[PDB]
Amino acid sequence: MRFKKHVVQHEETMQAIAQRYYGDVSYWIDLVEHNNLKYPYLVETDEEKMKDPERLASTGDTLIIPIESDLTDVSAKEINSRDKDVLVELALGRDLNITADEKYFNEHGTSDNILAFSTNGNGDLDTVKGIDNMKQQLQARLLTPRGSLMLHPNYGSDLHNLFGLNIPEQATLIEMEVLRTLTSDNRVKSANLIDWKIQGNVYSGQFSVEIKSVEESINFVLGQDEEGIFALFE
């Protein structure tokens, strides 16, 4: 259950509040009855409220409006930028940082024993959030061979076997495998080739990944309020 709570504003009236919220002034008597208010409902200052603190409310006192409010179906335009940042952060999850020391496991991508946990510098375990989290998960999936992870046959990639010849065919195989691996992630809305080239031994390519938009993540997290889990089991 959730309800709206209104702070009394300067020289406000109960009729104005009723019109503002219920869309009709007629509910002002219901508002009085629910809040248990005596006749001078909104006193000028606290000196009047001292006469009867129980039954009177002054400026800056909080009223309760029993309208069933719900965090979903709320216009994203009202939400504050920091609130949107936190919401997308929750949507994309928090996880322990393992992709630290990028250079090392970039020098040995195909091998095992390549990544490890790290500390945040404050004596606690390091954590990656939001975009850093997505980076970590996409790197780990691409680096993981498919079928090597226990309890998860399909998680991973087949790039360890695509160390083939230097022709456009193997390039296309790599590209298709990478697109499969990126598509496998639920959060990745789509992925597509940008550009590739061959330099004899070395292959080089780059991709573009569109994560779910702020609106979708906001809708998902605010929907999750009904359950209260606020966690990711994808």
Partner 1 sequence: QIYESIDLDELNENGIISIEFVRNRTNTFFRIVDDVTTFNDKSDPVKAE
Partner 2 sequence: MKTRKLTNILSKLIDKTMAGTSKITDFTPGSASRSLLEAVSLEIEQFYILTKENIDWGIQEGIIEAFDFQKRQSKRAYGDVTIQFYQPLDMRMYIPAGTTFTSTRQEYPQQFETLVDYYAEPDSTEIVVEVYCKETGVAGNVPEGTINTIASGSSLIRSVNNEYSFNTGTKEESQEDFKRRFHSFVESRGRATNKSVRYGALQIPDVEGVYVYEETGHITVFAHDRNGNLSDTLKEDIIDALQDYRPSGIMLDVTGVEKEEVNVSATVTISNKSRIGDTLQKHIESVIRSYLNNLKTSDDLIITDLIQAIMNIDDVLIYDVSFDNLDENIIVPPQGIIRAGEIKVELK
Partner 3 sequence: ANFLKNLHPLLRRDRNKKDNQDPNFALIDALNEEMNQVEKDAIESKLQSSLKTSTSEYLDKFGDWFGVYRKTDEKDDVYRARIIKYLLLKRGTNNAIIDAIKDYLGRDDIDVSVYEPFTNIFYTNKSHLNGEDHLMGYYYRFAVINVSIGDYFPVEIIDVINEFKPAGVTLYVTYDGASTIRGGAIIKW
| Shortest CB 16 distance to partner 1, Å | 6
Size of interface with partner 2, in residues (CB under 8 A): 12
Q: Does 10 bind partner 1 (CB under 8 A)?
A: yes
Q: Which of 49, 141, 146, 187 binds partner 2 (CB under 8 A)?
A: 49
Q: Which does 46 bind (CB under 5 to 8 A by kind): partner 2, partner 1, partner 3, none?
A: partner 2
CB neighbour list of residue 188: distance below 8 Å, 6 or more residues apart: 138, 182, 209, 210, 211
For residue 104, the tally of other CB atoms under 10 A from its CB is 11
Q: Which does 86 bind (CB under 5 to 8 A by kind): partner 2, partner 3, partner 1, none?
A: none
Which one, 15 or 118, has the nearer CB to partner 1?
15
* Residue 136 backbone phi and psi in degrees, to 5: -55, -45
For residue 176, the tally of other CB atoms under 10 A from its CB is 13
| Shortest CB 9 distance to partner 3, Å | 12
According to DSSP, the β-strands at 94-96 and 3-7 are unpaired
Decide: residue 17, CB within 10 A, 0-12 exposed, 13-18 middle, 19+ buried.
buried
CA angle at 207 for the pair 201 and 209, rounded to the nearest 5°:
155
CB neighbour list of residue 48: distance below 8 Å, 6 or more residues apart: 40, 56, 58
Q: Does 77 bind partner 1 (CB under 8 A)?
A: no
What span, in angstroms and rounded, lies between the C-alpha atoms of 134 and 162?
A: 24
Which one, 32 or 142, has the nearer CB to partner 2?
32
Which one, 17 or 191, has the nearer CB to partner 1?
17
Q: Which of 6, 13, 118, 129 binds partner 3 (CB under 8 A)?
A: 13
Q: Which of 29, 74, 96, 125 binds partner 2 (CB under 8 A)?
A: 29
Q: Binding mask 77-116 vs partner 2 (x if CB under 8 A, - otherwise)?
A: ----------------------------------------
Instruction: Reduce the DSSP state of residue 4 to 3 states and report it.
Output: strand
Q: Does 53 bind partner 2 (CB under 8 A)?
A: yes
Q: Which of 2, 4, 5, 20 binds partner 1 (CB under 8 A)?
A: 20
Six token digits for residue 180: 């499969």
Enumerate binding residues for partner 3 (CB under 8 A).
11, 13, 15-16
Enumerate binding residues for partner 1 (CB under 8 A).
9-12, 16, 20
